């Protein structure tokens, strides 16, 4: 069976497993002729009784659409014989952010931290402008190349989004620690702001070197956002009333917004504190968007963004 546009994955020689997850199986590999380093991700097939996974078709359609300096490149798709498997092939990236933050020996200047967030928010500008929600922002999904170029990764839970009637999207999304309060109160009509909440969490993590709201249960998570961001009243969040979970689910009243107080002793800078305050807004309507975040005086004050050698 002739097949021109889908090469055998044997053209890449394997090297080593480079990470566990939902995806499961990601290898590093070397192009057998040029020595180009890639990452090979197998298409999971754990008893699929409806042919090729529709989730895979969605992920593939998205990776083909999104081509931008700060989003991970899908090079091509590869196969492996008949009598049958499929691998996604990505331009290889040396590090992830959780690996560098969790290393005590790597250290970031204020100028270096800026350039990270400038690349991350520009990547999120690009995808939301292209009508795509990531829906799984965390430190582990922020890859940085050898050069120092940030690249967003793992579009497994990603989807397209519409302008409009009231939307009805999936609620079980984002890793619990980076989930917005919209979703933890049952919101099915969300959009770009859910990823910006995750960025705010990631920002703070640049200084704290560890995820800031490590909630065990979902109630724990929601009472722990209540602690940092203050309570969820309808004054702070107009028409939160009309959530169903708002009434039944326990919700701490006497809780002031203590977000800049608690992060003083990690992030010294006054602009960075103010940016994290505008990303960790409870109300998505009052939460800062991709474009306004890049315009914020954090990215335009001394010391300015700089390339990533340290």
């Amino acid at each position: 069976v002739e097949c021109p546009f889908c090469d055998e994955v044997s053209k890449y020689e394997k090297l080593a497993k480079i990470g566990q997850g939902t995806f499961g199986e990601v290898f590093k590999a070397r192009h057998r002729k040029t020595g180009q380093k890639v990452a090979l991700k197998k298409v999971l097939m754990e008893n699929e009784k409806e042919g090729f996974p529709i989730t895979a078709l969605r992920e593939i359609k998205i990776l083909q659409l999104l081509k931008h300096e700060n989003v991970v490149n899908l090079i091509e798709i590869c196969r492996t014989k008949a009598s049958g498997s499929i691998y996604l092939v990505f331009d290889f990236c040396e590090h992830d952010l959780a690996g560098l933050l969790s290393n005590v020996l790597v250290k970031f200047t204020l100028s270096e931290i800026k350039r990270v967030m400038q690349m991350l928010l520009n990547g999120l500008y690009y995808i939301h402008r292209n009508k795509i929600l990531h829906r799984d922002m965390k430190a582990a999904n922020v890859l940085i190349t050898r050069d120092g170029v940030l690249k967003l990764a793992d579009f497994g839970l990603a989807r397209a989004f519409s302008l409009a009637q009231p939307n009805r999207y999936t609620n079980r999304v984002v890793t619990l620690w980076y989930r917005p309060p919209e979703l933890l109160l049952g919101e099915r009509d969300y959009g770009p702001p859910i990823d910006l909440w995750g960025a705010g969490c990631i920002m703070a993590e640049m200084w704290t070197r560890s995820p800031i709201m490590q909630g065990n249960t979902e109630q724990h998570q929601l009472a722990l956002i209540s602690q940092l961001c203050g309570s969820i009243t309808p004054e702070v969040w107009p028409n939160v009333d009309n959530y169903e979970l708002y009434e039944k689910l326990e919700l701490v009243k006497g809780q002031k917004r203590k977000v800049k107080d608690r992060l003083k002793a990690y992030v010294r800078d006054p602009y960075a504190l103010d940016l994290i305050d505008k990303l960790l807004v409870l109300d998505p309507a009052q939460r800062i968007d991709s474009d306004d975040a890049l315009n914020h005086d954090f990215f335009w004050s001394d010391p300015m963004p700089s390339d990533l050698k340290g």
């Binding site: 069976v1 002739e2 097949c3 021109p4 546009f5 889908c6 009784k49 409806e50 042919g51 090729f52 529709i54 078709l57 593939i60 359609k61 083909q64 659409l65 091509e76 798709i77 196969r79 049958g84 499929i86």
Partner: protein
């Protein structure tokens, strides 16, 4: 890559089916019959015309690599549609697509037992043939159709229900009847469809006050020489297709 799936006339002449030994005219029948089957099946599955058009384009591109001798249209079309349904967000269940595809192809025959070896086979055959389409297409599944570029023109050049909808009909039939999808890009085909729809309604879109024609706002590559040549081609095969023009024909 932008000209991977677009071909010269001589490339279409010496195709995979020509190589195995299938007449040029005979190689249009199996294309038009696949489109005809995708339409029949899709109608019954309640997928949108979009999904069917995506499936027709997969099919058209599929046989630019593979041969009809090696892969019958009646095997491929249920797979190509099954895939188009999932890609376009109207996924239909595998057993439902098989079941439907059976009653189109075998109107009188009742279905096999779903416990049987013959059914369990033909289910696995569809799944296998889906993977074979994917790899042939190189996973390039996002198809742009001429129907998007119809509205760019017809609403903004301002012409009735009768003209607006006629131009869709042409675009839908250009996938069924021609191999324009494999030659001219979607916005070019959209111009051919509106040009023909204007000839069929005795409509005369005027010369814009610049000294300009309507098609230059849709795609600046297009000339009249080309539209007159391709509207001629599309109108011929519509006359040969029985009962198709009667849908758009004016009885008063």
């Amino acid at each position: 890559n932008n000209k991977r799936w677009y071909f010269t006339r001589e490339q279409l002449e010496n195709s995979p089916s020509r190589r195995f030994g299938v007449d040029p005219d005979k190689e249009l029948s199996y294309r038009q019959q696949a489109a005809n089957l995708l339409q029949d099946m899709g109608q019954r599955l309640n997928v949108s015309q979009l999904t069917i058009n995506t499936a027709i384009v997969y099919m058209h591109r599929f046989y630019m690599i593979q041969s009809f001798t090696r892969f019958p249209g009646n095997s491929v079309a249920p797979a190509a549609l099954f895939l188009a349904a999932k890609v376009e967000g109207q996924p239909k269940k595998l057993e439902h697509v098989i079941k439907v595809a059976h009653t189109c192809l075998h109107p009188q025959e009742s279905l096999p037992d779903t416990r049987s070896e013959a059914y369990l086979q033909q289910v696995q055959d569809l799944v296998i043939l889906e993977s074979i389409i994917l790899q042939t297409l190189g996973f390039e599944l996002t198809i742009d159709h001429p129907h998007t570029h119809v509205v760019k023109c017809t609403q903004l050049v301002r012409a009735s229900k009768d003209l607006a909808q006629t131009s869709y009909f042409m675009a839908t039939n250009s996938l069924h009847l021609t191999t324009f999808s494999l030659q001219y890009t979607p916005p070019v085909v959209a111009c051919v469809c509106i040009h023909l729809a204007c000839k069929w309604s005795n409509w005369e879109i005027p010369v814009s006050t610049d000294g300009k024609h309507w098609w230059e706002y849709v795609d600046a590559t297009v000339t009249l020489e080309l539209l007159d040549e391709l509207t001629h081609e599309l109108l011929q095969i519509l006359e040969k297709t029985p009962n198709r023009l009667k849908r758009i024909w004016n009885w008063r």
